[PDB]
Design a binder for this molecule. Structure first.
Ligand SMILES: *[C@@H](CCCCCCCCCCCCCC)C(=O)NCCNC(=O)CCNC(=O)[C@H](O)C(C)(C)COP(*)(=O)O
Lengths: 875, 125
């Protein structure tokens, strides 16, 4: 009400500016350091010496040979946005810069860019120059069909919307070199109208061709010195400089309701035209005064309250005195007021001038201080008699007219050659809506999982390097927990990703520095973060001496679950399992080993469910692990499964299988054809692991002669060193007693989708009763069918729960046989220590691409100003 | 395609009536000339004197695209003409009209492919 427009709060911004400035904090540091970004025109752009001429008004030649330029403009990631290279070539670099900067700004707000699909969000942007059109025409290569959407100005906002699936006004306009602030005003009005809820504003200025500079020099618009003398008595004109920046806006009540970071708030803004004057480019002092007053009225804010005004400050000897004259009419009424312009250190951006001025004002509000104005020493003589409290801070100066009782307020202004003028009022953001100082407490001293992602391996290396640099620069200014929270939840996860686990900031610095130069062929995630992983309850065979010692000594949930299961083991199976877990000799004996792996796997699953909260998208069980799988699958009770595993361990020991196991790489159908060729039905296939790996069970002599024959057949076949047989007509004496004794179990409907490997169709959810266990010890297990069903059902991420990987290669082959990419992981490696615990293994789940709750690991945390991932920059 | 709808005259423009030098008039975008002329014609059709609107808060919006005149001048190589700054930049499309009529409301030009023809009306509303 007091502001006729609904106040709008800026919740994030992005920018790519000359002198290597790609982050608002980098701009702030450069401004405080008093650095310059104007340089000589790079030769690869064009020959500056060819077109340079110090003589004014010489046709075909320019008066300036300098300018602010990016490190590169051709750099762009077509792969990340799914753009064809052929198409990406025809794209105006302005569009690419807009897209990249907008994506950076969205992430700078902590929001997931992908999360905004279908959302009622608008976008407004300004395009001024079409240098790429000039280059394409002079090259005569615009016959490419991809030029139509790659050169048309309107596509820019449309391209952003189509990339992000936004549903809200998309605008590509121009207001000469005032487009950015005009876009800000348009977005503010649109949010006030309620047509949208999130809006993006900004503009990009790309310098690529010289003819425009020559034409500008012909008008005398360019400074011969090569630096903008904004408000200085030596005002020589502006300097063309590259630039692109974007700002995200949300309604202030909505921002407060969502608690999103509020960099600042804009109370109001207005716009008008100078009208009739001498030429099309003569500013009107009265018009500027009128727009100031109109903006103030719209914001309902008194002028003397505002301390610092972000003027245009272009450096033109004609324009600057007029602009100074206009401001003194309104601002600087007795109360001292500081004057600032971003052009002094960057030059002029023909589209981003408004946006960069706004961002500089935002930073000034954030630090309550004003940077000095570069190259400035004194005002022009025409302003010597003007009476006002306005002043230009020659150095870094605290906020003028500091007042605790009033929020700090900043006025911004932008003007274009077209004559349209935009002015806006920016107010300091309110106090922290969240708990003060984020409610500090007993921060966990256990190492934190610091996530990380990027677009490519080398890009990931560079991102890690710069992030380590930044953390080193702020190892004390921030907190580890907040940084971890920001990385996990306040940042989009690019396909190429990894993580570093650390407990203290110097440790994290060292870890990041390790990878910053250390080489490793990282690969993009296979999963899309839409489904949880699939546990692999692998069977016996991978046990080793004292597997659980580290886990007991580091995972409280693991030890608690082990102690929970331990008395049931000593009751049903008749012996303690903790001693075998801590045994310094590898556990042997079908009675002794069988409950041990069950307990290990169920404890690991419980740890993942509680200490890390990762839910399984599906569950895969191997041999006796199938019951352990049903434990977490929600189909079997813990006590019932413990009774099952202990009773089967006891019962199989009666005859110790009475047979042997033979594994052959021959295909299962080919194996069946070979076996039937000799009438050796006394053996039968026991495991269906992969189309290139099968396991056959039978009596010892026949298995031995079969594997000898296959070796004579020039095909690998091994009689494994297992003590007992499985799924063979040799464990038959125990089957009846097993079925009779184990019928007391009470299975139920699984809580997690489960693939019955023993059953013919893993997709069907089994009853997993005593008969199912009789089959699991007597009928063939189709692990190949299970993994094939899981892949067909879209699941891609799999992780072995075994103490050592056993079938990761096998499932890789199954996926390779299906030709679909997959990720297979191992819970633990043979004699592999892990002081960090399963947390390190958790990183691999993230790297694969499975879904999980990050808040489960990071319930709360204040977002911070950690840097952003780099990009692939193929020219 | 070999056909289409085409104006009776495109290069035709009454630069003298609006006080425009032939040089800038030769270099100004014909689209801008057409917009200015038809805007004056619409103003008169409303029954209002265009001179009367001088010094008023009226605003202007316009949709522009297909900067083919840039292609033409690039092919001719006469980009060195200083009038190109205000003769080919899309910004002056609204700005030239505002300055000629002496209006004070916001002047803005935009591009939304083939939807500018009505999105301008929405923005004015
Ligand atoms: C920013 C606008 C300046 C940068 C725009 C560059 C235009 C290039 C167009 C290229 C098109 C074709 C490309 C391929 C060939 C800005 O702030 N504008 C305002 C600058 N200050 C103004 O208020 C006035 C600036 N100039 C002046 O002070 C006068 O207009 C002068 C004296 C230079 C013009 O002479 P006369 O009309 O007084």
């Amino acid at each position: 009400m007091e502001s006729r427009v609904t106040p709008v709060a800026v919740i994030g911004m992005g920018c790519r500016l000359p002198g290597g400035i790609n982050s608002p904090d980098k701009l702030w540091e450069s401004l405080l350091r008093g650095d310059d970004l104007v340089t000589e025109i790079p030769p690869d752009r064009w020959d500056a010496d060819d077109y340079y001429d110090p003589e004014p008004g010489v046709p075909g030649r320019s008066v300036s040979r300098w300018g602010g330029f990016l490190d590169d403009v051709a750099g762009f990631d077509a792969e990340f946005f799914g753009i064809s290279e052929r198409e990406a070539t025809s794209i105006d670099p302005q569009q690419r810069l807009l897209l990249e900067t907008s994506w950076e700004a969205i992430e700078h707000a902590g929001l997931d860019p992908a999360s905004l699909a279908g959302s009622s969000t608008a976008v407004f942007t300004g395009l001024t120059h079409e240098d790429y059109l000039v280059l394409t025409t002079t090259a005569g290569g615009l016959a490419s069909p991809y030029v139509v959407t790659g050169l048309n100005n309107s596509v820019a906002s449309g391209r952003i919307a189509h990339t992000l699936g936004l549903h809200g006004p998309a605008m590509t306009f121009d207001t000469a070199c005032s487009s950015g602030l005009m876009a800000v005003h348009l977005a503010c009005r649109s949010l006030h109208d309620g047509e949208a809820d999130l809006a993006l504003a900004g503009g990009c200025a790309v310098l690529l061709e010289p003819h425009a500079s020559v034409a500008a020099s012909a008008q005398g618009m360019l400074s011969s010195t090569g630096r903008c003398h904004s408000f200085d008595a030596d005002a020589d004109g502006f300097v063309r400089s590259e630039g692109c920046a974007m700002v995200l806006l949300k309604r202030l009540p909505d921002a407060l309701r969502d608690g999103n970071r509020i960099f600042a708030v804009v109370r109001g803004t207005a716009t008008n035209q100078d009208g009739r004057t001498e030429t099309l480019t003569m500013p009107s002092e009265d018009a500027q005064v009128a727009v100031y007053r109109a903006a103030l009225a719209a914001a309902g804010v008194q002028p003397e309250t505002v301390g610092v005004v972000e003027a245009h400050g272009t450096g033109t000897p004609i324009g600057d005195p007029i602009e100074y004259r206009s401001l003194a009419r309104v601002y600087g009424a007795g109360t001292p007021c500081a004057l600032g312009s971003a052009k002094s250190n960057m030059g002029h951006s023909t589209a981003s001038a408004g946006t960069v001025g706004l961002i500089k004002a935002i930073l000034s509000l954030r630090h309550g201080v004003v940077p000095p104005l570069l190259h400035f020493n004194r005002l022009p003589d025409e302003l010597s008699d003007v009476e006002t409290g306005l002043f230009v801070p020659q150095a870094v100066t605290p906020w003028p007219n500091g007042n605790d009782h009033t929020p700090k307020r900043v006025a911004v202004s932008s003007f274009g050659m077209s004559g349209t003028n935009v002015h806006a009022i920016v107010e300091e953001a309110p106090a922290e809506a969240s708990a003060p100082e984020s409610s500090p407490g007993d921060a966990e001293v256990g190492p934190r999982l610091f996530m990380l992602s990027s677009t490519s391996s080398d890009a990931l290396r560079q991102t890690a390097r710069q992030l380590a640099t930044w953390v080193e620069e702020h190892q004390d200014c921030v907190a580890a927990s907040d940084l971890a929270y920001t990385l996990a939840r306040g940042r989009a996860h690019r396909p190429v990703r990894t993580a570093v686990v650390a407990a203290n900031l110097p440790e994290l610095v060292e870890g990041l520095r390790e990878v910053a130069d250390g080489d490793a062929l990282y690969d993009a995630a296979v999963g899309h973060g839409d489904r949880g992983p699939v546990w692999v309850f692998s069977g016996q065979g991978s046990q080793w001496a004292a597997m659980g010692t580290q886990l007991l000594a580091s995972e409280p949930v693991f030890a608690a679950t082990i102690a929970k299961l331990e008395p049931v083991i000593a009751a049903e199976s008749g012996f303690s399992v903790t001693e075998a877990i801590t045994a310094q000799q590898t556990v042997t004996g079908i009675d002794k080993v069988q409950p041990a792996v069950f307990a290990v796997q169920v404890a690991l699953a419980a740890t993942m469910e509680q200490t890390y909260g990762v839910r399984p998208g599906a569950v895969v069980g191997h041999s006796m692990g199938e019951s352990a799988a049903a434990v977490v699958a929600g189909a079997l009770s813990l006590e019932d499964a413990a009774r099952v595993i202990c009773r089967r361990s006891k019962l199989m020991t009666r005859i110790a299988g009475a047979g042997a196991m033979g594994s052959v790489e021959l295909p299962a159908k080919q194996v069946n054809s070979e076996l039937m060729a000799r009438g050796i039905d006394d053996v039968v296939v026991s495991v269906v692991a992969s189309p290139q790996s099968t396991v056959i069970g039978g009596t010892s002599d026949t298995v031995r002669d079969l594997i000898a024959r296959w070796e004579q057949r020039d095909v690998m076949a091994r009689e494994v060193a297992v003590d007992v047989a499985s799924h063979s007509p040799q464990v038959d004496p125990i089957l009846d007693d097993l079925a009779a004794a184990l019928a007391d179990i009470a299975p139920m409907t699984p809580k997690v989708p489960y693939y019955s490997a023993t059953l013919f169709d893993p997709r069907e959810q089994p009853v997993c009763d005593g008969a199912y266990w009789v089959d699991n010890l007597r009928n063939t297990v189709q692990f190949a069918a299970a993994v094939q069903a899981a892949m067909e059902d879209g699941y891609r991420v799999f992780a072995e729960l075994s103490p050592h990987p056993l079938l990761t290669h096998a499932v890789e082959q199954t996926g390779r046989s299906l030709d679909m990419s997959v990720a297979a992981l191992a819970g633990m490696r043979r004699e592999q220590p892990l002081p960090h615990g399963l947390r390190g293994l958790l990183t691999e789940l993230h790297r694969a691409g499975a879904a999980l709750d990050y808040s489960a690991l990071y319930p709360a945390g204040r977002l911070v100003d950690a840097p952003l991932p780099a990009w692939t920059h193929a020219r």
